[PDB]
Amino acid sequence: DMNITVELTFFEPYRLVEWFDWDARKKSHSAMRGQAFAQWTWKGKGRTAGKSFITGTLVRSAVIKAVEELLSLNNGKWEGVPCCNGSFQTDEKKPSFLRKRHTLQWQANNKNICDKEEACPFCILLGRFDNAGKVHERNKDYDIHFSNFDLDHKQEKNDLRLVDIASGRILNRVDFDTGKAKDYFRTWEADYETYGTYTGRITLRNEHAKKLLLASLGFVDKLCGALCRIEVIHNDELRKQAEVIVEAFKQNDKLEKIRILADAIRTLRLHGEGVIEKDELPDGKEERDKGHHLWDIKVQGTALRTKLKELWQSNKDIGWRKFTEMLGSNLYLIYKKETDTEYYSKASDLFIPVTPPEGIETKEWIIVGRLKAATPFYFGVQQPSDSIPGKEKKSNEHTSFNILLDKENRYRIPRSALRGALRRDLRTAFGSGCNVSLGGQILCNCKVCIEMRRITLKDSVSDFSEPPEIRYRIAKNPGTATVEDGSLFDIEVGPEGLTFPFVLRYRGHKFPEQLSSVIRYWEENDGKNGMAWLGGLDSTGKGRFALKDIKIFEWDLNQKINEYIKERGMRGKEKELLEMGESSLPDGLIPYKFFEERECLFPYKENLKPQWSEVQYTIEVGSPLLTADTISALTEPGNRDAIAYKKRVYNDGNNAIEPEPRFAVKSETHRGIFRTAVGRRTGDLGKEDHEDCTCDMCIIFGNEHESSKIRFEDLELINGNEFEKLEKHIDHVAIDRFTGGALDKAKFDTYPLAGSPKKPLKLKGRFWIKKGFSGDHKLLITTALSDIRDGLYPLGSKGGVGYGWVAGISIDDNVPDDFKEMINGPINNDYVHPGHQSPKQDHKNKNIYYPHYFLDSGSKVYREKDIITHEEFTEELLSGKINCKLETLTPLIIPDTSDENGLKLQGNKPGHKNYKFFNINGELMIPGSELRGMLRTHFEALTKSCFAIFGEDSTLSKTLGGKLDKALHPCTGLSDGLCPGCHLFGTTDYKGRVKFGFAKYENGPEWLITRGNNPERSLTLGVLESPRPAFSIPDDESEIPGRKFYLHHNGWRIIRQKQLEIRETVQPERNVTTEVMDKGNVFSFDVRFENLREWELGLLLQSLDPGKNIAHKLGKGKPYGFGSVKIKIDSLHTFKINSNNDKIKRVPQSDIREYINKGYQKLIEWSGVLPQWHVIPHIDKLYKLLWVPFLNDSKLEPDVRYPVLNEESKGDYTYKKLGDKDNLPYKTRVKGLTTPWSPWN
RNA sequence: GACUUAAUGUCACGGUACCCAAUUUUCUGCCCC
Ligand SMILES: [Zn+2]
Ligand SMILES: [Zn+2]
Ligand SMILES: [Zn+2]
């Protein structure tokens, strides 16, 4: 007669679904599948407010299952009271739910046939001989009656909305044999923190089974998908502002910038509110004069930074992280607007009793530990703007994917993903099993599915609520080796090193060897490193969790069952159990001392361990490494264009993120590098479609219909504390082809890691290889690794100027050694250019020649529409590496413009810039970008290409660009073709095929002493005024003379021998003091070339070594005769793809002499024994400028100077009378500026 | 007490949001009426 009230509390996020009805439930698959979940009925008319509840029938079913288990445990008797076998068969209505399950059954000891006068306690709780059945509720005639389990005070008197209690989520069924999810389904996952308690009542009319009912209530463990214990007692305004910002950006034709702006705002949550409050955003280039290219865009008449500040001051009421997240989400949604399968399972009537053998014992095992992540994990989730549980649309893939976080933003590992990973690991360990089939009427007898019906895990959430970091992926176009437009993706990943609590329970008659094998596989003790692949980006190594601190405790459900009900099996109190002494364990629970080691288990030693084999190596980089973090450089206040990539690493010991970010090369970059290497080696790269392709690259790297067999990891930098300045500031500039000066606002900054040839960066990374590869694929992997070793694919960005050039690879000794089984005289040019001109046979005259002359070569350019691709190594085209020596004939000046006070002489004379010679980690070297433009300009004029870096929009005193011939304008796209010089070194939209390495210093005199005068072995250079494009174009009728080249002379001795005249008299603070090196040094730089044609290699080798008595001009101070480098090729190496896998072979002098001769045939072909280049009219003019008179012809010493204006130095070659039409007409001086070595007297 | 459950039968802890993508190509820190 007594009424029992029951309290139901959940310790996991439970699932709830719409209640609908029973008759109308069949019309909705979501409610039909979720009959074991909590229900939800709407209260209002707008489908926004309702009350959740749990039906009493589900709790009754759980109680019946608990009763069956308890009675079976104690040999069919409870407290000395025997029980019958029950009755679960009906036929003639029928129950609304059918069993379709094995019912635990009993043997004997029933008193008699159960009638409605002596019903056993099992019959009392089962409600067999009651007055009410399946007809209707009618009255409370039930001997046992379960009422609805409504919510509690958490509901409150406010009609709680569904959005406040539940959050929709999508779960998959991942195919084991392939790796791609077959189908998905939706559910609503309520939270257990606030709305996890349900209250109900249980009515008993017969007191014969009170003890059994209470014991069953204690024994109930799972309900509605969550572990439970039963006890007896401003987006709208943000969206509008985001669309206003998008419209303002569109008014400036900058819609593509909206994506990067949204991503930057989203990433801004990592930085504090002081970034916007104190204006800590980058200030942009000062020389640009237009402000930052993004943060200074005028939105409705106001700067973007000020607009963001106003938005923060107006919407700070919702915190900082939420504000930035909402703004980024709204901007991304507006940008996207402007631009599988759902299978909810299914719905015999066979009674299947199961009688366990007599005398057997049943025990429950508890495994507790920590799932410490070893790589940045990622648990995917649909877009929050699309979840909206309750308001889902019916029937444009997203390019931005978030991560799974709970209501407190704590990182979460759902028990769904953990259970799926455990299921697949058990499947691998067992060697058999079935793909999970839904809707079956029978329980499959699989070796895995039997074990997974008794294993229960727990939802785990970290104690870390910091925002996740965003990782970027790009799709390189194979044809042009550039970034494909509209191929940007971003994944939010968590930090590396978080610890998630891990709880596992197994209730069986014996602990299986396969489950223990899986546990030892997951555990990371000594040399195991952990292999619990948890997450959703395994192909790039995101989520290799490692079980730690494993503690196994064993119950005893035969004699110590009463303690199990009394303590509720330690459900929800596992965290305390993990870190408590064994002397305080609850009675009936003992530690498991029979847990075998990893080497003692057979399934682990055979099936689980050799599935994934790691390959680890330390990549040595002997050059700057710039990974070009694209959003961090847009947020950090350093005001730099490109910075190196860095990570955030969690530290368990300090329970916080490491204060120093870890520099590394992205695992995505590693994967792309090896994928490109393998694709180009095997020729499968560049194929039209990979929809159903089964090529080698698709086989060993996965496609849309499969999963990759190789998983990569990050390239962490270990050699990081041996530099004392890890990253060096290197800045470049674009030089006009006509004036010869900088292109005004064209400078860009780079901040890469300071890798040095003698102090190289050491990056240590690894990748896992799945078992089952044949010999061919392992050979392909080893070949790709060897290609990476030989420096074919430079790491990072700016690989064409010598950034991230690999110097070697040292594989790990333990395990990669198995795959380790698969892994003449110097060239001389004898061409002597006559170049006699005026200076020759004029020793006693001592004429004066203008320092710079203009090379005119017409307006005829041949553009090739058959652009050579980078998809594959073409057989007929050459590819290899040039190793050449650079020797200086005049003092060379390469200023280290990073620090304008390298000599620290600004104290005495402020405003006087002081640079040093370029050096990385204290050793002198020449930048590869300075050699690139030094050879490109020579090669562009040699092949009569266009003015690639010409600067238009400058007027006279109809713009220089307008005056230039239309054929010589820079090549914009690939539609019209590319110039001969624009096709080797490449332009935008086409990566160049020639890469120039850094020029280290090897031998020769160290510095220029300059005894006396200058203290710090330097030369105080004269004033270097900006070039004036008015002496060459006096009138509008005159056209652009063409390229500008500087004569070769040793006039720097005037600067050196009169140093006291410059720095003391005249030119107070507009000069420059730089360290210089004396003539006679040697520099070794490698020019890697790829897929060059037959004559393109001859032109290159002719450009590097034009012959005797010809040299190039390099470095600052060219008009003064500074930096006349003499490049000689030491050895040419050329490899080729072949079946025999022949290594790199160095071509002899005969091939080089043949290569150059074939290159000469191209030049004469375009115009229309040993070659004589001085026959072509334009080459003859070019080689006169590069002719050096003082190399061997010692008697020559031309006087090369700029004429003074007046009254400065006239000791008649003065600008006072040189532009006057009376003395020298305009048509004459232009002709005098075009012919090299024309004496101006 | 209804808005919410039928009762001699609820493996939904019966299902990883899983697979595909090099942050990147090009640019000499240059220089005279
Ligand atoms: Zn009975
Ligand atoms: Zn099965
Ligand atoms: Zn061109």
Task: Please give the full DSSP string across A970-1006, using - where no structure is assigned.
Answer: PP--SSS-B-HHHHHSEETTEE-SEEE--EEEEES--
- Checking each nucleotide's C1' against the CA of A1218, the nearest proves to be B33
| C-beta of residue A281 within 8 angstroms of C-beta of residue A275 | yes
Q: How far is CA A161 from CA A41, A155, A158, A390, A519, in A?
A: 11, 9, 9, 10, 42
Strands A852-855 and A1043-1046: antiparallel
Q: Which ligand is nearest to the CA of A427?
A: 2
- Residues of A 902-941 whose CB lies less than 7 Å from any atom of strand B: 927, 929-930, 932-934, 936-937
Q: How far is the CA of A602 from the C1' of B1 (A)?
A: 63
Q: Are A1124 and A1112 in contact (CB under 8 A)?
A: yes
Q: Which pair of structure tokens corresponds to residue A484?
A: 């494909």
CA A653, distance to chain mean position in Å, is 27
Please, what's the largest Cα pairwise distance for chain A?
142
DSSP code string of A572-598:
T-HHHHHTS-GGGPPTT-EE------G
Q: What angle do CA A132, A133, A134 make, to 5 degrees?
A: 135
Strand B nucleotides with an atom less than 7 Å from a protein beta carbon: 1-33
Tell me which DSSP letter residue A467 carries: P
Q: Is the CB of residue A1116 inside 7 Å of nucleic acid strand B?
A: yes
Range A423-427 contact pairs with CB under 8 angstroms and sequence separation of 24 or more = A423/A448, A423/A452, A424/A174, A424/A176, A425/A518, A425/A521, A425/A522, A425/A532, A425/A608, A426/A451, A426/A452, A426/A514, A426/A515, A426/A518, A427/A176
Gaps in chain A following residue numbers (C to N > 2.5 A): 92, 233, 339, 347, 395, 823, 957, 1168, 1211
Paired tokens of A304: 């973007």
What is the C-alpha to C-alpha distance for residues A119 and A209, in angstroms, rounded to an integer? 10
A644 closest CA partner among A756, A726, A725, A714: A726
Exposure of A1143 by Cβ count < 10 A (0-12 exposed, 13-18 middle, 19+ buried)? Answer: exposed
- CB-based contact A833:A1174 (threshold 8 Å): yes
| Contact assessment for residue A55 and residue A148, using Cβ atoms and an 8 Å cutoff | yes
Does residue A1000 lie within 7 Å of nucleic acid chain B, judged by its CB? Answer: no
> How would you label A1206-1237 residue by residue, b for 16+ Cβ within 10 Å and e otherwise?
eeeeeeeeeeeeeeeeeeeeeeebbeebbebb
Cα–Cα dist A954/A959, whole Å: 5
Shortest-distance nucleotide from A39 CA to C1': B4
Chain centroid, CA A489 distance in Å = 9
Question: What residues contact residue A337 under an 8 Å CB cut-off, 6+ apart?
Answer: none
β partners of residue A204: A144
Q: Is the CB of A1224 under 7 A from strand B?
A: no
Q: Are A370 and A462 in contact (CB under 8 A)?
A: no
Tracing tokens 């000062």 back to the chain, one arrives at A286
Residues 733-752 of A with CB within 7 A of strand B? 733-735, 739-743, 746-748
Which of A378, A302, A348 has its CA nearest to residue A441?
Answer: A348
Give the resolution to one decimal, in Å: 3.2
Amino acid at A767: F
Any binding-site annotation on A690? yes
How far, in Å, CA of A844 to CA of A850, rounded? 19
For residue A495, the one-letter residue type is P
Distance CA A387, CA A186 (A): 9
A946 is an annotated ligand-binding site residue: yes
| DSSP-derived secondary structure for A151-217 | --TTSGGG--BGGGTEEEEEEEEE-TTT-SEEEEEEEEEE-TTTS-EEEEEEEES-GGGHHHHHHHH
Three-state DSSP state, A73: helix
Rounded to whole angstroms, how far apart are CA atoms A448 and A423?
7
Using CA atoms of A1150, A1155, A1161, A1162 in order, give the dihedral in degrees to the nearest 10: 180
| Nearest alpha carbon to residue A891 among A1033, A1020, A991, A698 | A1020
Distance separating alpha carbons of residues A531 and A552, to the nearest angstrom: 19
Quick check: A379 CB within 7 A of strand B?
Answer: yes
The DSSP bridge pattern shows strands A748-751 and A642-643 to be: parallel
Cβ < 5 A residues, ion ligand 2: A 434, 444, 446, 449
Return d(Cα A844, Cα A901) in angstroms, integer: 44
Helices A257-267 + A235-251 axis angle, to 10: 140
Residues 6 or more apart from A472 whose CB is under 8 A from it?
A: A488, A489, A490, A630, A631, A666, A668
Q: Are A149 and A228 in contact (CB under 8 A)?
A: no
Q: Are A620 and A807 in contact (CB under 8 A)?
A: yes
Length, in residues, of chain A: 1241
Question: What is the C-alpha to C-alpha distance for residues A664 and A648, in angstroms, rounded to an integer?
Answer: 11
CA of A753 vs C1' of B5, distance in Å?
Answer: 67
What's the distance, Cα to Cα, between the start and end of chain A in Å?
127
Quote the CA–CA distance of A396 and A375 in Å, as a whole number: 31
Instruction: Answer for the pair A1217, A1211: CB distance below 8 angstroms, yes or no.
Output: no
Q: Which amino acid is at A91?
A: D
Whether A671 and A539 have beta carbons less than 8 Å apart is answered as yes
Question: Distance (Å, rounded) from C-alpha A635 to C-alpha A271?
Answer: 9
Q: Which ligand is nearest to the CA of A115?
A: 1
Q: Cβ of A1074 < 7 Å from strand B? A: no
Q: How far is CA A1163 from CA A181, A624, A635, A878, A1175, in A?
A: 59, 37, 50, 19, 11
Q: What is the DSSP string of A1221-1235?
A: TTTS-HHHHHHHHHS
Residue nearest to nucleotide B9 (CA to C1'): A99
Q: How many CA atoms lie within 13 A of A870 on its CB side?
A: 22
Tokens of A252: 């400036």
Nearest to A1123 by CA among A926, A899, A830: A926
H or E element, residue A807: strand A806-811
Tokens representing A1153 are 């002499």
For A113, A741, A959, A1029, A1233, the CA distances from A1033, given in Å and listed in that order, are 120, 17, 11, 7, 11
DSSP A752-793: -B---SSS-EEEEEEEEEETT--HHHHHHHHHHHHHHHTTSS
Alpha helices by DSSP H, A601-640: 602-603
Q: Is A634 helix (H, G, I), strand (E, B) or coil?
A: coil
Q: How far is the C-alpha of A1079 from the C-alpha of A1008, rounded, in Å?
A: 8
Whole-angstrom distance, CA of residue A777 vs CA of residue A790: 20
Contacts of A1154 (CB under 8 A, 6+ apart): none
Which residue's structure tokens are 């901007």?
A: A331
A62 φ/ψ angles, rounded to the nearest 5 degrees: -60, -40
Q: How many CB atoms lie within 10 A of CB A482?
A: 15
Quick one: which H or E segment has residue A81?
strand A81-82
Structure-block tokens of residue A1007: 């510095």
H or E element in which residue A472 lies:
strand A469-477
Protein residue at shortest CA distance from C1' of B24: A483
**Interatomic separation, CA of residue A228 and C1' of nucleotide B6, rounded (Å):** 23
CB A370 within 8 A of CB A550: no
Q: How far is the CA of A65 from the centre of ligand 1 (A)?
A: 16
Q: Residue A690: helix, strand or coil by DSSP? A: coil
Q: Is the CB of A489 under 7 A from strand B?
A: yes
Please, where are the H alpha helices in A220-268?
235-251, 257-267
CA nearest neighbour of A276 among A304, A236, A245: A304
Strands across the sheet containing A1072-1075:
A913-915, A1072-1075, A1018-1021
DSSP string, A911-948: T-EEE-B-EETTEEEE-HHHHHHHHHHHHHHHTT---T
Is the distance from CB of A54 to CB of A61 less than 8 angstroms?
Answer: no
A47: left (phi over 0), alpha (psi -120 to 50) or beta: left
List residues bridging with A372 in a β-sheet.
Answer: A499, A546
Are the beta carbons of A950 and A961 closer than 8 angstroms? yes
Of A989, A865, A974, the C-alpha closest to A484 is A989
Cα dihedral A86, A88, A92, A95 sign? positive
Phi, psi dihedrals of residue A878, rounded to the nearest 5°: -90, 155
Partners of A642 in the β-ladder: A750
